Design a protein around this motif. Structure first.
Motif, short mmCIF file in Angstrom:
data_model
loop_
_atom_site.label_atom_id
_atom_site.label_comp_id
_atom_site.label_asym_id
_atom_site.label_seq_id
_atom_site.Cartn_x
_atom_site.Cartn_y
_atom_site.Cartn_z
N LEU A 114 89.81 26.93 -14.69
CA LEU A 114 91.06 27.70 -14.79
C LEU A 114 92.29 26.80 -14.87
N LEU A 115 92.33 25.73 -14.08
CA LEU A 115 93.42 24.74 -14.15
C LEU A 115 93.54 24.18 -15.55
N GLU A 116 92.40 23.86 -16.15
CA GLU A 116 92.43 23.33 -17.51
C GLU A 116 92.96 24.40 -18.47
N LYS A 117 92.48 25.63 -18.34
CA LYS A 117 92.88 26.68 -19.29
C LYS A 117 94.40 26.91 -19.27
N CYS A 118 94.97 26.83 -18.07
CA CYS A 118 96.38 27.08 -17.86
C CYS A 118 97.27 25.89 -18.18
N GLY A 119 96.67 24.79 -18.64
CA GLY A 119 97.44 23.65 -19.08
C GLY A 119 98.05 22.85 -17.95
N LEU A 120 97.46 22.95 -16.77
CA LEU A 120 97.99 22.27 -15.59
C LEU A 120 97.44 20.88 -15.37
N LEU A 121 96.40 20.50 -16.10
CA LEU A 121 95.88 19.14 -16.01
C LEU A 121 96.44 18.27 -17.13
N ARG A 122 96.72 17.01 -16.84
CA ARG A 122 97.11 16.03 -17.87
C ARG A 122 96.12 14.88 -17.83
N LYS A 123 96.14 14.05 -18.87
CA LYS A 123 95.40 12.80 -18.83
C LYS A 123 95.81 12.06 -17.58
N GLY A 124 94.82 11.74 -16.75
CA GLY A 124 95.08 11.04 -15.51
C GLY A 124 95.20 11.87 -14.24
N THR A 125 95.22 13.19 -14.36
CA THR A 125 95.21 14.04 -13.16
C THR A 125 93.97 13.74 -12.32
N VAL A 126 94.19 13.52 -11.03
CA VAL A 126 93.12 13.16 -10.10
C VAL A 126 92.64 14.39 -9.34
N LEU A 127 91.39 14.77 -9.54
CA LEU A 127 90.77 15.79 -8.69
C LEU A 127 90.04 15.07 -7.57
N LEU A 128 90.22 15.57 -6.36
CA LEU A 128 89.54 15.04 -5.18
C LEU A 128 88.89 16.23 -4.46
N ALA A 129 87.57 16.19 -4.34
CA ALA A 129 86.79 17.33 -3.86
C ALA A 129 86.08 17.01 -2.55
N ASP A 130 86.33 17.83 -1.53
CA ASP A 130 85.63 17.69 -0.25
C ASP A 130 84.22 18.31 -0.33
N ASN A 131 83.34 17.82 0.55
CA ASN A 131 82.07 18.48 0.84
C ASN A 131 81.11 18.47 -0.32
N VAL A 132 81.10 17.40 -1.11
CA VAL A 132 80.20 17.41 -2.25
C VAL A 132 78.74 17.13 -1.88
N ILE A 133 78.49 16.76 -0.62
CA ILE A 133 77.12 16.66 -0.08
C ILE A 133 76.81 17.84 0.84
N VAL A 134 77.69 18.10 1.80
CA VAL A 134 77.49 19.20 2.73
C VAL A 134 78.80 19.95 2.95
N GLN A 160 100.27 31.52 -12.34
CA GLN A 160 101.71 31.72 -12.14
C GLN A 160 102.48 30.42 -11.94
N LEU A 161 101.78 29.30 -11.78
CA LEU A 161 102.46 28.07 -11.38
C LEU A 161 103.53 27.61 -12.37
N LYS A 162 103.23 27.69 -13.66
CA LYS A 162 104.19 27.21 -14.65
C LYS A 162 105.43 28.09 -14.72
N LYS A 163 105.25 29.40 -14.74
CA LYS A 163 106.40 30.29 -14.94
C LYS A 163 107.16 30.55 -13.64
N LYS A 164 106.44 30.85 -12.57
CA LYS A 164 107.09 31.24 -11.33
C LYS A 164 107.48 30.06 -10.43
N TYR A 165 106.70 28.98 -10.48
CA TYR A 165 106.96 27.80 -9.64
C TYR A 165 107.44 26.58 -10.43
N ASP A 166 107.77 26.79 -11.70
CA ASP A 166 108.32 25.73 -12.54
C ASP A 166 107.49 24.42 -12.49
N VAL A 167 106.17 24.55 -12.54
CA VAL A 167 105.29 23.38 -12.62
C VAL A 167 105.05 23.04 -14.09
#
Ligand SMILES: CCCNc1ncnc2c1ncn2[C@@H]1O[C@H](/C=C/CNC(=O)c2cc(-c3ccc(F)cc3)cc(O)c2O)[C@H](C)[C@H]1O
Ligand SMILES: [Cl-]
Ligand SMILES: [Cl-]
Ligand SMILES: [Mg+2]
Length: 213
Positions: free
Chosen positions: A151-171, A123-130
């Protein structure tokens, strides 16, 4: 009466309204001296701060707010006009997070959406104007990091250079996500070794920069 409520109450009893650093310090003190909680914490938080300052994102999405500690941490470093959207499926946590940000004086920079990421993302693109996201912080159930990234990729929300930062990748770990981004030519990855919040246990953050299709 719940741990999350007790954290909020401690902040309200102790910290200064409108002062995000005082809010973060109160939470860290409570969680060190009274009861542990799964906030990103000060060790990983300092790495988050350095990443946020480096990239100066205009629009950040957070998946999983919990009590709002990471939302306070990020929102306090946003440039004027930049914004954070945070998704939180648990209604009690969404309310605690909203109140935490209100207390910190950051409510003007953050939108807290109470719902499931898999329902809100489309809903981000249509309802939240992202258009597209500049950064995404993943800190919800660890088995949802990969499904939501896809899902983010499918919905076209990522661009070249979008930074994903993920917590807890060890524990606790997020083995499917971590293997996926590290093996994919569509991401450039960097690992930041650190410590589990409030504990002498190694954990880390993964930064995965989207390279396009
Ligand atoms: C299916 C719906 C998905 N969509 C969703 N959409 C929106 N919101 C969602 C979604 N799925 C979940 N949420 C929300 O995110 C939060 C959940 C966060 C989960 N975090 C952990 O489990 C963790 C554990 C440890 C840990 C480490 C060591 C230990 F010994 C014990 C624990 C440490 C850590 O730093 C951790 O972040 C919040 C509670 C929850 O309602
Ligand atoms: Cl947090
Ligand atoms: Cl810590
Ligand atoms: Mg976490």
């Amino acid at each position: 009466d719940t741990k999350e409520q007790r954290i909020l109450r401690y902040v309200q009893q102790n910290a200064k309204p409108g002062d995000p650093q005082s809010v973060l310090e109160a939470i860290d003190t409570y969680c060190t001296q009274k009861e542990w909680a799964m906030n990103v914490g000060d060790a990983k938080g300092q790495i988050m701060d350095a990443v946020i300052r480096e990239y100066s994102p205009s629009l950040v999405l957070e998946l999983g707010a919990y009590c709002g500690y990471s939302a306070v941490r990020m929102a306090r470093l946003l440039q004027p006009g930049a914004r954070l959207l945070t998704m939180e499926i648990n209604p009690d946590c969404a309310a605690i997070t909203q109140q935490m940000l209100n207390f910190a004086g950051l409510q003007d920079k953050v939108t807290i959406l109470n719902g499931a990421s898999q329902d809100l993302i489309p809903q981000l693109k249509k309802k939240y104007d992202v258009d597209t996201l500049d950064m995404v912080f993943l800190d919800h159930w660890k088995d949802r990091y990969l499904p939501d990234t896809l899902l983010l990729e499918k919905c076209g929300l990522l661009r070249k250079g979008t930074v994903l930062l993920a917590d807890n990748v060890i524990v606790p770990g997020t083995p499917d996500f971590l293997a996926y981004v590290r093996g994919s030519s569509s991401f450039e990855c960097t690992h930041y070794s650190s410590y589990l919040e409030y504990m002498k246990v190694v954990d880390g953050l993964e930064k995965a920069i989207y390279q396009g299709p």
